[PDB]
Amino acid sequence: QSLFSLAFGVGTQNRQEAWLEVFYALPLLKPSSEIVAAVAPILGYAAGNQALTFTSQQAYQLADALKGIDAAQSALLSRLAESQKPLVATLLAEDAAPSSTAEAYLKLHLLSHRLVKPHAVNLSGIFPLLPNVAWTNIGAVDLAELAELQLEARLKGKLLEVFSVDKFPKMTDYVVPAGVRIADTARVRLGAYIGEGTTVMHEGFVNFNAGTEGPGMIEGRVSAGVFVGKGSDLGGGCSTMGTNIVISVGEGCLIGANAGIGIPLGDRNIVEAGLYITAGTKVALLDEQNALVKVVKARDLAGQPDLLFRRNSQNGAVECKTNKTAIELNEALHA
Amino acid sequence: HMSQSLFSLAFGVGTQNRQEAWLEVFYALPLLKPSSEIVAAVAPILGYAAGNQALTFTSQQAYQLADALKGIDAAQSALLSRLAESQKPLVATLLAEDAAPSSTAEAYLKLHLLSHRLVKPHAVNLSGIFPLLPNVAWTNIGAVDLAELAELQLEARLKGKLLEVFSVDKFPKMTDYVVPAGVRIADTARVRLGAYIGEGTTVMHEGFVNFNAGTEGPGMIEGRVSAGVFVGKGSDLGGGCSTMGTIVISVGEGCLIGANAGIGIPLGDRNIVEAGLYITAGTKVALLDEQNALVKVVKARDLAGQPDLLFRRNSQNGAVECKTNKTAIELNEALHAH
Amino acid sequence: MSQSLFSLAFGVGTQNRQEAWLEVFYALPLLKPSSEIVAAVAPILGYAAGNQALTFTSQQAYQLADALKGIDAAQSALLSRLAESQKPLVATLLAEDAAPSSTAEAYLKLHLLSHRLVKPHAVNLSGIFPLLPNVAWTNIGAVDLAELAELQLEARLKGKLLEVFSVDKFPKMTDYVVPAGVRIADTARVRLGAYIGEGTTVMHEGFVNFNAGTEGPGMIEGRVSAGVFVGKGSDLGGGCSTMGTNIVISVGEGCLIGANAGIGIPLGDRNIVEAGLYITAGTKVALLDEQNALVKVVKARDLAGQPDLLFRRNSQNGAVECKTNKTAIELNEALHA
Ligand SMILES: CC(C)(COP(=O)(O)OP(=O)(O)OC[C@H]1O[C@@H](n2cnc3c(N)ncnc32)[C@H](O)[C@@H]1OP(=O)(O)O)[C@@H](O)C(=O)NCCC(=O)NCCS
Ligand SMILES: CC(C)(COP(=O)(O)OP(=O)(O)OC[C@H]1O[C@@H](n2cnc3c(N)ncnc32)[C@H](O)[C@@H]1OP(=O)(O)O)[C@@H](O)C(=O)NCCC(=O)NCCS
Ligand SMILES: CC(C)(COP(=O)(O)OP(=O)(O)OC[C@H]1O[C@@H](n2cnc3c(N)ncnc32)[C@H](O)[C@@H]1OP(=O)(O)O)[C@@H](O)C(=O)NCCC(=O)NCCS
């Protein structure tokens, strides 16, 4: 049939031939049947979701087969043929729970290349498929081999720098999508979706299966599964709750420095610097005269546009200011 | 008028992309107010007529310049000798005046001046700098143009290596150009070129200092110093505190901004902000005399620049308070005197 | 009378142009090394007594590897590798856990912490700061600050970069050790001397100072200051703060410190601190019984160390409250015991 995706990767394996990591230069969403046909026989692809290793020699064949069908992929395989490191071609018939490390990595590539958006792809059971790895200046290094390599570097007056020890590498070591800034790339995980015109500042962080439509200024934390709409700004040190109700931020929102949200934010919401709006926070909802409409749980204001959340600096009450009348607010609360 | 006495000059080695756009320039020994002797020796070889200039120059010219400066400035001469061997492209940037920058090379020089501490935040004209500072991939092999990156990432992978991309931004990190004396910076990813880190300052891991910002020194920085924010002598910014971006926010001498707190106003000398409190410009504050009685309720904004304030949030009634050691008459004078 | 040592380790390190030690790396540090090891090794090193950082030669390295052949295979193998080294070697033999007296020793004690051979507060780190020189931590390793500018220039001349990722007295831990069963998202944020317990994951916003850390397991996404130890199964939410240092702050077992919150007191077991709340020691808290009636207004300091407390700020009246599943009578007894 029509495949969901395919990509030709170069990766790394440990001493026991386990896959630590795979890099895909040119992943494809819904590749053309012409490409799949030409490639399927050579790789030994029958059906379903497969991570198929292949050889330098098979690389040259595949390069030739795709000459004249897709120039881009052919030139990639031609480079892949000179590779010292092992090769995998992962071909996915369906968008399903991943079954291999190679597939898990491809699906995170699809997100970070912006082929698919957060929540558009199945990442169920990915965690056991992503091995904990030492991310170093020489690449991924298995934790069982690391101490030895660290010693040998020191003997030569050198340093094996270990900049991360984790199941997810940092995105920019695999892709930097167009029209994006990321001040400290240590803080954006492979699998993050950084929309065009987004700038993630130093205090900003974006988990996998999360990100920004773009444009936007991210200076706080976007947790797994959180997606931030168009033109929204997250101030320095702000928090977006993780972990059911998914957290999102709408369009044109402003989340203040050091503040936080545990509810989904509707469009053009503002949260005061320093304010943490928890799902069960009891909020004094105010109409456009700043008169109490009623006290509600923050959870119940989820998705409503044009709210300003603030903590009253004289009586300590968390207040939600609107430009709507009481009868309007009550209507919104019940539909 | 004829050729002047310059604002700055520096000999730099930088990096260009395939279309010869400058990504980046490194100046080892930048000069504030260089002597007329240095300029007179160098100008004819560089072809510097007047004003503010980013003049590319050759290896041969580098030797010529080293010779001309021999016996005028030993340091500069020696640098030019080294520069003459370089593989990378050279630029001499001579600025007659401190004006809005007109080139990437000039932009980079002005950020160096700040980070070498030759000038302080706000003393230098940085207007319109963003469009001169191209977005670049800062990698372990240096600056790399974004259109050239994906290719280079592939080639490293094919050799079993990694092209590490530690930052994608218009500003590189300062310490890849300068580490000024008497300074600690725990995670250097968090101090931009253009930051001024004063002697005896320590920037901890959670600390951050933008361009055109920083510390007099000494001090402990563990929160975020936004662009244009200067922190006096002996002031401490607690872990994860915030200073608001952008009128001008500053911090006086001897302040303590609590962990996870924040300021949207200039804090006068010896102010204290309680851990967890965000003092917003429009925050309504209970100003209290000694004896802790209410003087009026003011906007935090009207307390800007006042010394010896303690800011706190009453833990029993939620009121943001400013405690003072002053009478109602004293406070009246401090807030309203002409 | 020569003793039975607190610690010993063979290190390879880096010196500046004035032969001052910037840094030492210990591959396999020993806690309470056997008398058999100390006896084979001491005459070659010239160890006499006490706490000693003893430099040694490549030839001495071979001798030591030969002496420990058939006593401790691992140490012998290490010494054989050290014999090939281009960098200078030191053997640090510590008779006692005492205030450190050398850069070599200060580094060993932090190694002991990070290998998890000892726990935070179990080791004497008194006066350590003067022993740990401020160093530029680069991609080529430790560099003296007086030599750095020159090396920065030379890299630029070759179109390369001398990356300078930290300028500090403490390097990052993972450049020395990655202990088993641990995840650290951004390793710039865990210092040598951190104790990161098995099953701990330190996310990107997490930070752990020296002489601090986690029993394990747990999720650390906030700041663990020096001298702060966090019990089994406790979660520190994103950007939470743990006050620095005379009450020593600690977090008990099974606690939840919310995102952007903070503690200036020790937290007893199974405590919860609402997201965004900072609880300082002088913070006045409304202590509520299992029926949510006011029992008493107390300073948070006096609730420190009690189990099963939920700290929250009342979103309607601004009062910092502490909720419990105990009666007024049980609570008053705890405040008076
Ligand atoms: C919440 C926020 C948006 C409100 O500011 P605002 O409404 O735009 O501007 P103002 O301060 O003029 O608001 C008007 C009134 O609210 C009052 N006010 C503001 N915050 C208050 C509070 N927490 N409690 C009581 N009154 C408050 C002001 O004093 C003023 O009173 P007035 O009507 O008697 O003049 C702002 O204070 C804030 O927190 N912004 C966050 C920005 C940020 O953190 N990051 C962006 C990138 S740095
Ligand atoms: C704001 C701060 C300075 C107040 O503490 P302080 O003035 O040093 O000393 P205390 O805590 O003893 O204050 C004295 C009184 O005020 C009370 N108090 C303190 N904070 C209060 C609050 N927020 N609401 C009501 N009462 C409070 C104390 O209970 C005590 O009451 P008492 O007069 O009945 O005995 C402090 O709590 C703080 O937040 N410091 C920030 C440090 C930090 O975050 N980082 C530094 C880097 S390690
Ligand atoms: C404080 C906290 C623990 C309370 O949550 P909870 O008790 O488990 O769940 P609930 O929301 O049902 O709380 C129960 C009651 O408290 C109320 N409540 C919660 N916070 C309140 C507040 N600050 N002021 C007043 N009421 C509050 C709820 O409305 C609810 O009221 P009800 O009994 O009238 O229906 C939670 O809000 C919190 O801060 N969690 C921190 C988690 C975090 O930041 N990170 C975890 C790692 S991702």
Descriptive labels:
homotrimer, 335 residues, alpha/beta, Alpha-Beta Plaits, Wheat Germ Agglutinin (Isolectin 2), domain 1, UDP N-Acetylglucosamine Acyltransferase, domain 1, 6 helices, 27 strands, 2,3,4,5-tetrahydropyridine-2,6-dicarboxylate N-succinyltransferase activity (chain B)
What do you see in this structure?
Three copies of one chain form a homotrimer. Chain A is α/β, with parallel strands linked by helices and 335 residues long. Chain A folds into three domains: 1-129, 2-Layer Sandwich (Alpha-Beta Plaits); 130-170, Wheat Germ Agglutinin (Isolectin 2), domain 1 (2-Layer Sandwich); 171-335, Hexapeptide repeat proteins (UDP N-Acetylglucosamine Acyltransferase, domain 1). In chain A, 19% of the residues lie in helices and 28% in strands. Chain A contains six helices and 27 strands. Chain A has helices spanning 33-43, 56-66, 71-80, 101-112, 146-155, 326-334; strands at 5-13, 19-24, 28-29, 50-54, 87-92, 133-136, 139-141, 162-166, 181-182, 192-194, 198-200, 205-206, 210-212, 216-218, 221-222, 227-228, 232-234, 239-240, 248-249, 254-255, 260-261, 270-271, 276-277, 282-286, 292-297, 308-311, 318-321. A ten-stranded mixed β-sheet of chain A has the order 9-11-14-17-20-22-26-27-24-25, covered by helices on one side. In chain A, helix 1 (33-43) packs antiparallel against helix 2 (56-66). The longest helix of chain A has 12 residues, at 101-112. The first copy, chain A, is elongated. Chains in contact: A-B, A-C, B-C. At the B-C interface, helix 3 and strand 9 of B face helix 5, strand 8 and strand 24 of C. Chain A: Homotrimer. Chain A: Mg(2+) binds at residue 203. Chain A: It catalyses: (S)-2,3,4,5-tetrahydrodipicolinate + succinyl-CoA + H2O = (S)-2-succinylamino-6-oxoheptanedioate + CoA. Chain A: The active site is at 219 (acyl-anhydride intermediate). Chain A: Its EC number is 2.3.1.117.
